Design an enzyme around this catalytic site. Structure first.
Site, PDB file in Angstrom:
ATOM      1  N   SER A 162      31.626 -34.806   6.057  1.00 27.24           N
ATOM      2  CA  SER A 162      30.241 -35.225   6.267  1.00 27.24           C
ATOM      3  C   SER A 162      29.409 -34.121   6.937  1.00 27.24           C
ATOM      4  O   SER A 162      29.414 -32.981   6.476  1.00 27.24           O
ATOM      5  CB  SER A 162      30.209 -36.543   7.051  1.00 27.24           C
ATOM      6  OG  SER A 162      28.901 -37.106   7.109  1.00 27.24           O
ATOM      7  N   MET A 163      28.724 -34.448   8.033  1.00 28.00           N
ATOM      8  CA  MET A 163      27.871 -33.495   8.742  1.00 28.00           C
ATOM      9  C   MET A 163      28.608 -32.234   9.191  1.00 28.00           C
ATOM     10  O   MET A 163      27.988 -31.187   9.357  1.00 28.00           O
ATOM     11  CB  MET A 163      27.233 -34.171   9.960  1.00 28.00           C
ATOM     12  CG  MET A 163      26.134 -33.359  10.629  1.00 28.00           C
ATOM     13  SD  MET A 163      25.326 -34.268  11.963  1.00 28.00           S
ATOM     14  CE  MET A 163      26.648 -34.341  13.169  1.00 28.00           C
ATOM     15  N   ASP A 304      19.630 -46.100  -1.711  1.00 29.32           N
ATOM     16  CA  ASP A 304      18.787 -45.119  -2.409  1.00 29.32           C
ATOM     17  C   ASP A 304      17.327 -45.191  -1.951  1.00 29.32           C
ATOM     18  O   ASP A 304      16.698 -44.162  -1.693  1.00 29.32           O
ATOM     19  CB  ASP A 304      18.866 -45.361  -3.922  1.00 29.32           C
ATOM     20  CG  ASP A 304      17.936 -44.454  -4.716  1.00 29.32           C
ATOM     21  OD1 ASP A 304      17.843 -43.250  -4.394  1.00 29.32           O
ATOM     22  OD2 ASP A 304      17.302 -44.949  -5.675  1.00 29.32           O
ATOM     23  N   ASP A 324      29.164 -42.283  -2.282  1.00 30.81           N
ATOM     24  CA  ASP A 324      30.396 -42.738  -1.625  1.00 30.81           C
ATOM     25  C   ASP A 324      30.172 -43.895  -0.641  1.00 30.81           C
ATOM     26  O   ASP A 324      31.076 -44.247   0.121  1.00 30.81           O
ATOM     27  CB  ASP A 324      31.089 -41.559  -0.919  1.00 30.81           C
ATOM     28  CG  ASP A 324      30.201 -40.877   0.117  1.00 30.81           C
ATOM     29  OD1 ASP A 324      29.154 -41.445   0.495  1.00 30.81           O
ATOM     30  OD2 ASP A 324      30.554 -39.764   0.555  1.00 30.81           O
ATOM     31  N   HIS A 356      33.299 -43.093   1.511  1.00 33.91           N
ATOM     32  CA  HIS A 356      32.970 -41.963   2.374  1.00 33.91           C
ATOM     33  C   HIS A 356      34.025 -41.635   3.447  1.00 33.91           C
ATOM     34  O   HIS A 356      34.408 -40.476   3.610  1.00 33.91           O
ATOM     35  CB  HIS A 356      31.603 -42.216   3.013  1.00 33.91           C
ATOM     36  CG  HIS A 356      31.084 -41.061   3.802  1.00 33.91           C
ATOM     37  ND1 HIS A 356      31.112 -39.764   3.335  1.00 33.91           N
ATOM     38  CD2 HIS A 356      30.503 -41.009   5.021  1.00 33.91           C
ATOM     39  CE1 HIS A 356      30.584 -38.962   4.241  1.00 33.91           C
ATOM     40  NE2 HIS A 356      30.205 -39.694   5.271  1.00 33.91           N
TER      41      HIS A 356
END
Ligand SMILES: *[C@@H]1O[C@H](CO)[C@@H](O[C@@H]2O[C@H](CO)[C@@H](O[C@@H]3O[C@H](CO)[C@@H](O)[C@H](O)[C@@H]3O)[C@H](O)[C@H]2NC(C)=O)[C@H](O)[C@H]1NC(C)=O
Ligand SMILES: *[C@@H]1O[C@H](CO)[C@@H](O)[C@H](O)[C@H]1NC(C)=O
Ligand SMILES: *[C@@H]1O[C@H](CO)[C@@H](O)[C@H](O)[C@H]1NC(C)=O
Ligand SMILES: *[C@@H]1O[C@H](CO)[C@@H](O)[C@H](O)[C@H]1NC(C)=O
Length: 375
Positions: A162-163, A304, A324, A356
């Protein structure tokens, strides 16, 4: 097998605090602690009422004049476990099962002959902040990589989630090519939010308590807004369409070009200042310049866009796209774009049906890692 450095994402590593506060919001909040204690993750601190004390300690204070964050008065925070892995493997050390994060991956590496704190080491950081305020972390990271190269006789593989990928890209962009060529074997990117994610808007507007359903979204929103990392992950124009509408309300739309309006309208002007501070940190087009494996999850409904019936104190209706569950599929375009600008190899890998977080303990993910390390 080459040495490995693990880089967590947002909320991805433990954090500790020590208190000597002049005053608190409620009488039942502690003024003083005798030592450092676990602030993240501690489930006991996230219950109703007690949450106010926790927020008061974990929030960052934004100084508008200096354009920088400070800790609350009498509060100090440190990142434990640098160079180790315990802080990445489990989020709440007392609370075993529920907080498992990097554990499964690390256990697999150990099964293949690695050793905790030796061949494999973690690079946790203060994920509340942006790279601009974690200079020391990057110095330590560079030095740790050099040490591991010398000790174990070979270049390191970075594995980021991720980040963590954005943090490590920032890092790599700032190292000379000669250094990267020597010290980095490969960069394995897991669920990287290149160009931000849609969920950021909902979090900032109305709060997001998906993980912490016992607490009201509007209460937790206070803390979430305070973290610079939140505003840093707002959608960027090089990945998303400049004209794409992310948020609709009864009176107005919001695209990525309307962030100033958004922050003013939701009553958090500090966030606009945060975004201005951080949006230029990572050069959008510059590749990391190392062998890259981009793994992304698909087939999972991912927020979204949002419709707000009432702005911003009422939870919105959510439209879903691909990804994800957290990171939008559209993020994976950046890897696609780097593929055509290739000195170094760039390999893309879809992970259909992988969530995710679940991707970190997924057998297919681990099998790919095996390929990178032993092949
Ligand atoms: C946000 O950070 C800024 C900058 O670090 C802080 O600025 C403060 O400004 C006052 C003056 O308005 C400073 O005092 C002055 O220092 C100069 C030396 O440069 C001296 O010539 C003057 O006689 C006067 O003493 C003060 O040092 C500085 N405050 C600090 C560093 O804490 C501002 O206070 C910060 N705001 C918050 C809420 O933390
Ligand atoms: C994206 O934003 C940056 C900074 O405002 C700007 O330089 C760039 O031209 C933008 N891209 C567009 C308008 O397509
Ligand atoms: C947002 O823009 C679209 C396209 O221009 C338009 O159809 C719609 O009416 C706008 N939405 C709101 C809530 O103003
Ligand atoms: C792992 O990924 C596979 C295919 O990529 C998927 O079918 C499965 O649901 C995932 N399982 C776990 C435990 O993450």
């Amino acid at each position: 097998h080459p040495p490995v450095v693990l880089v967590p994402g947002d909320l991805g590593n433990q954090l500790e605090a020590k208190l000597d506060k002049p005053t608190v919001v409620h009488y039942l909040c502690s003024k003083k602690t005798e030592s450092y204690f676990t602030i993240w993750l501690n489930l006991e601190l996230l219950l109703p009422v007690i949450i106010d004390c926790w927020i008061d300690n974990i929030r960052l204070v934004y100084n508008k004049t200096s354009r920088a964050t400070q800790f609350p008065d009498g509060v100090d925070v440190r990142v434990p476990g640098f160079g180790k892995t315990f802080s990445l493997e489990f989020l709440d050390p007392s609370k075993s099962s529920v907080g498992s994060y990097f554990h499964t991956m690390v256990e697999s590496l150990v099964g293949w002959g690695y050793t905790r704190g030796e061949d494999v080491r973690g690079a946790p950081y203060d994920w509340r902040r942006a790279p601009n305020e974690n200079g020391p972390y990057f110095l330590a990271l560079r030095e740790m990589i050099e040490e591991m190269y010398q000790l174990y006789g070979g270049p390191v593989v970075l594995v980021a989630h991720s980040m963590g990928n954005m943090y490590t890209l920032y890092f790599l962009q700032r190292q000379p090519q000669a250094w990267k060529d020597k010290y980095i074997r490969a960069f394995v990117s897991l669920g990287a939010p290149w160009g931000g994610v849609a969920k950021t808007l909902r979090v900032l507007a109305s709060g997001d308590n998906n993980r912490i359903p016992v607490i009201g979204p509007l209460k937790i929103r206070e803390q979430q807004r305070s973290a610079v990392s939140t505003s840093w992950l707002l959608p960027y124009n090089y990945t998303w369409s400049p004209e794409k509408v992310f948020v609709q309300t009864p009176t107005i739309n919001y695209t990525l070009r309307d962030y100033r309006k958004f922050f003013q309208d939701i009553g958090f002007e500090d966030g606009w200042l945060m975004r201005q501070d951080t949006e230029g940190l990572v050069e959008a087009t510059m590749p990391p310049g190392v062998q890259l494996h981009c793994l992304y999850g698909t087939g999972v409904p991912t927020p979204d866009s949002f419709y707000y019936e009432s702005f911003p104190d009422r939870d919105p209706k959510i439209c879903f796209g691909d990804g994800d569950g957290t990171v939008n599929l559209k993020s994976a375009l950046q890897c696609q774009a780097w593929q055509s600008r290739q000195e170094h190899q760039v390999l893309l890998q879809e992970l259909p049906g992988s969530e995710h977080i679940e991707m970190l303990a997924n057998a297919t993910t681990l099998a790919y890692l095996k390929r990178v390390l032993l092949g």
